[PDB]
Amino acid sequence: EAPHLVQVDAARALWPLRRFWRSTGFCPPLYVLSWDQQLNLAYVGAVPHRGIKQVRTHWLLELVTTRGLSYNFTHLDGYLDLLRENQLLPGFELMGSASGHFTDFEDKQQVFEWKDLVSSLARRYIGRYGLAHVSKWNFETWNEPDHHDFDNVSMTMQGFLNYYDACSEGLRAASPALRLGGPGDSFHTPPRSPLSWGLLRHCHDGTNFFTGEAGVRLDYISLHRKGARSSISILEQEKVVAQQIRQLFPKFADTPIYNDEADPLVGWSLPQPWRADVTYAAMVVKVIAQHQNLLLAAFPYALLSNDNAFLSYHPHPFAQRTLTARFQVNNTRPPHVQLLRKPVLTAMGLLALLDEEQLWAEVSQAGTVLDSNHTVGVLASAHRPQGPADAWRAAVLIYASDDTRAHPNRSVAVTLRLRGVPPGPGLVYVTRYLDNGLCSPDGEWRRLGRPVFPTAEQFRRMRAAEDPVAAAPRPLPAGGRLTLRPALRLPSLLLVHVCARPEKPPGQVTRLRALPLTQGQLVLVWSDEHVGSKCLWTYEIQFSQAYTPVSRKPSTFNLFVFSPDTGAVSGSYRVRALDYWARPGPFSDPVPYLEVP
Ligand SMILES: *[C@@H]1O[C@H](CO)[C@@H](O[C@@H]2O[C@H](CO)[C@@H](O[C@@H]3O[C@H](CO)[C@@H](O)[C@H](O)[C@@H]3O)[C@H](O)[C@H]2NC(C)=O)[C@H](O)[C@H]1NC(C)=O
Ligand SMILES: *[C@@H]1O[C@H](CO)[C@@H](O)[C@H](O)[C@H]1NC(C)=O
Ligand SMILES: *[C@@H]1O[C@H](CO)[C@@H](O)[C@H](O)[C@H]1NC(C)=O
Numbered sequence: 320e321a322p323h324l325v326q327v328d329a330a331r332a333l334w335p336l337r338r339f340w341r342s343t344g345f346c347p348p349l350y351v352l353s354w355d356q357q358l359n360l361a362y363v364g365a366v367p368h369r370g371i372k373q374v375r376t377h378w379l380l381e382l383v384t385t386r387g388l389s390y391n392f393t394h395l396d397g398y399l400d401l402l403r404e405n406q407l408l409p410g411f412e413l414m415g416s417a418s419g420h421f422t423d424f425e426d427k428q429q430v431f432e433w434k435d436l437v438s439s440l441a442r443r444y445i446g447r448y449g450l451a452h453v454s455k456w457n458f459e460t461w462n463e464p465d466h467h468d469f470d471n472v473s474m475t476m477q478g479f480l481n482y483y484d485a486c487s488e489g490l491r492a493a494s495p496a497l498r499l500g501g502p503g504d505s506f507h508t509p510p511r512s513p514l515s516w517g518l519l520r521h522c523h524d525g526t527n528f529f530t531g532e533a534g535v536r537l538d539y540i541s542l543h544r545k546g547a548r549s550s551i552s553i554l555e556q557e558k559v560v561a562q563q564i565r566q567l568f569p570k571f572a573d574t575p576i577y578n579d580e581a582d583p584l585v586g587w588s589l590p591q592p593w594r595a596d597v598t599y600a601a602m603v604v605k606v607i608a609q610h611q612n613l614l615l616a617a618f619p620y621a622l623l624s625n626d627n628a629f630l631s632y633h634p635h636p637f638a639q640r641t642l643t644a645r646f647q648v649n650n651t652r653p654p655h656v657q658l659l660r661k662p663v664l665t666a667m668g669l670l671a672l673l674d675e676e677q678l679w680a681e682v683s684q685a686g687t688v689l690d691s692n693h694t695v696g697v698l699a700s701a702h703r704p705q706g707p708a709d710a711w712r713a714a715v716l717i718y719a720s721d722d723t724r725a726h727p728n729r730s731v732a733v734t735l736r737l738r739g740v741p742p743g744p745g746l747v748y749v750t751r752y753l754d755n756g757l758c759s760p761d762g763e764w765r766r767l768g769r770p771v772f773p774t775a776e777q778f779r780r781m782r783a784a785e786d787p788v789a790a791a792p793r794p795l796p797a798g799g800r801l802t803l804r805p806a807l808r809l810p811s812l813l814l815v816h817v818c819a820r821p822e823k824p825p826g827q828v829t830r831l832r833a834l835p836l837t838q839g840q841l842v843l844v845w846s847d848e849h850v851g852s853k854c855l856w857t858y859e860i861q862f863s864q865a866y867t868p869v870s871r872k873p874s875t876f877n878l879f880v881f882s883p884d885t886g887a888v889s890g891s892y893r894v895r896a897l898d899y900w901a902r903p904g905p906f907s908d909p910v911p912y913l914e915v916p
């Protein structure tokens with residue numbers, strides 16, 4: 320592209336910037352407690368600053384069995400505990416037959432039983448995690464009721480309404496604070512998608528199966544719309560459906576709309592080279608910027624989820640719609656699993672640095688102003704100080720993305736003119752850059768000859784490309800102004816982080832834990848919930864076999880694979896935050912690790 324001017328005015332905070340994109344999801348195949356999944360959700364929960372919050376999970380109610388009605392919740396307990404351990408919430412689709420029990424939602428007895436199952440499970444988890452926590456969950460209907468083969472379950476139009484009423488009453492009986500929505504489907508033009516449009520009319524005007532009341536609770540409306548490789552198309556399609564909802568159903572004018580399957584392209588398992596690397600990452604940011612700049616900044620849009628928490632399959636470790644790249648290394652004894660962080664997951668960590676107020680910004684090319692429906696765009700945020708562990712911040716995230724198309728020839732000259740940064744102590748800036756040249760684990764894999772079972776050393780070389788290229792903190796010029804002139808590739812992401820120096824140093828890393836990978840290798844993962852500030856250079860890790868630093872390139876991602884040359888991993892580990900002014904936080908409580916022949 321021709322040169323782009325990107326202006327950001329830090330003195331001009333316009334309105335809130337809600338972090339509406341912090342969701343992923345997946346469908347188990349016909350698993351959720353496997354070691355593979357345990358590693359996967361550790362990667363998902365390791366996005367800093369709760370950058371991913373929800374995991375929308377299909378078939379949760381196939382993790383419950385019945386007797387008689389009694390319910391065995393053992394498997395469901397295991398999955399929800401695993402999300403909880405990783406600071407994640409279920410996108411709780413009320414989806415499953417309870418291992419064959421439910422077959423017909425026009426059978427009155429089954430409808431009552433469904434309500435009891437939903438009451439029972441809700442009360443259980445309110446008891447297990449607390450009401451405050453469970454009230455944050457998006458309980459949702461069965462996935463895509465108009466595009467699903469219900470098979471051994473009979474789910475008619477009326478059945479779906481009966482089912483819904485049982486979901487709603489089941490949750491109500493447990494607590495009125497619990498949230499329910501649906502249908503989680505595309506809303507094709509009537510007379511298509513009868514169960515989806517039918518749900519809305521039923522909730523607007525229909526009769527409640529249990530109470531006879533006119534209308535039924537619907538806390539949010541969830542749709543699914545994908546891009547067919549176009550980013551802007553997602554937004555376009557959402558607006559058409561939201562307008563039809565608004566016109567047909569006056570009561571839903573302020574009802575929140577979710578797009579909880581908002582992917583570039585339908586079909587997660589289809590190999591696509593652009594899914595492997597920064598191409599997918601930059602498009603995801605582009606879609607988000609489009610939503611903030613062209614919609615939210617007036618339909619009541621509240622949530623966007625990229626449905627990309629699936630585990631990839633041989634022979635396509637990198638090329639599927641996944642946050643991680645899975646390698647089932649079958650030539651070791653015993654065989655083991657390794658995951659790599661793909662650029663899309665790393666990108667969610669850059670988005671996570673965006674703060675609560677949107678700053679004025681303008682992108683232009685030779686004086687023509689361009690909105691986010693273009694290949695180059697920006698999201699800029701500012702943060703107002705909380706306490707003494709906090710201070711003023713600005714985060715500027717620039718994308719260069721031609722959707723699913725990557726051209727190795729293609730670059731863009733950007734001039735970033737940041738002004739209006741308020742006076743503050745120890746002002747510094749840090750840049751983080753991602754492109755396919757420097758930061759593609761898939762690139763490194765292909766350069767090594769695409770080994771199906773990479774060696775330990777080969778895995779090290781691939782992982783070295785996971786993190787962005789980071790420039791050390793530099794002091795900001797006086798007058799609160801900064802001009803940068805980066806060359807950006809297409810695709811690429813550039814985050815410019817400007818921080819004032821908090822009075823106190825970082826807080827403590829917590830919930831350190833170690834997941835075994837194989838002999839001589841483990842994953843360390845931790846929480847940043849008490850660290851306080853986002854102005855972090857790295858997490859210093861120490862190992863006592865006393866304590867010595869594990870030297871590594873800077874990384875703010877809350878997970879590290881330890882794979883020393885020696886295979887000596889027995890001992891204890893501890894982790895602490897290091898800020899932009901070289902001040903450490905307190906070390907986490909340490910975690911022991913013992914390999915036993
Ligand atoms: C290493 O061992 C594992 C055994 O766990 C092998 O995993 C299996 O890999 C195949 C893919 O080559 C998977 O089959 C695929 O399933 C999907 C979804 O149903 C389907 O779309 C594909 O066409 C294909 O049938 C299979 O699910 C998977 N099984 C498990 C339990 O993970 C892996 O292939 C072995 N690696 C090598 C190189 O032999
Ligand atoms: C519940 O299911 C689990 C695992 O599937 C099993 O270990 C447990 O014994 C079951 N409890 C029953 C049948 O009461
Ligand atoms: C985005 O730009 C294209 C032309 O490049 C235009 O046809 C489309 O309508 C635009 N969409 C929006 C929502 O601005």
Ligand SMILES: *[C@H]1[C@H](N)[C@@H](C(=O)O)[C@@H](O)[C@H](O)[C@H]1O
Pocket residue numbers: 345346377462463543580582584585586587588626
């Ligand atoms: C939505 C979608 N049809 C699927 C896909 O695109 O692969 C997947 O994202 C999800 O499991 C479906 O509900």
Ligand SMILES: [Cl-]
Pocket residue numbers: 582583584585640
């Ligand atoms: Cl996709």
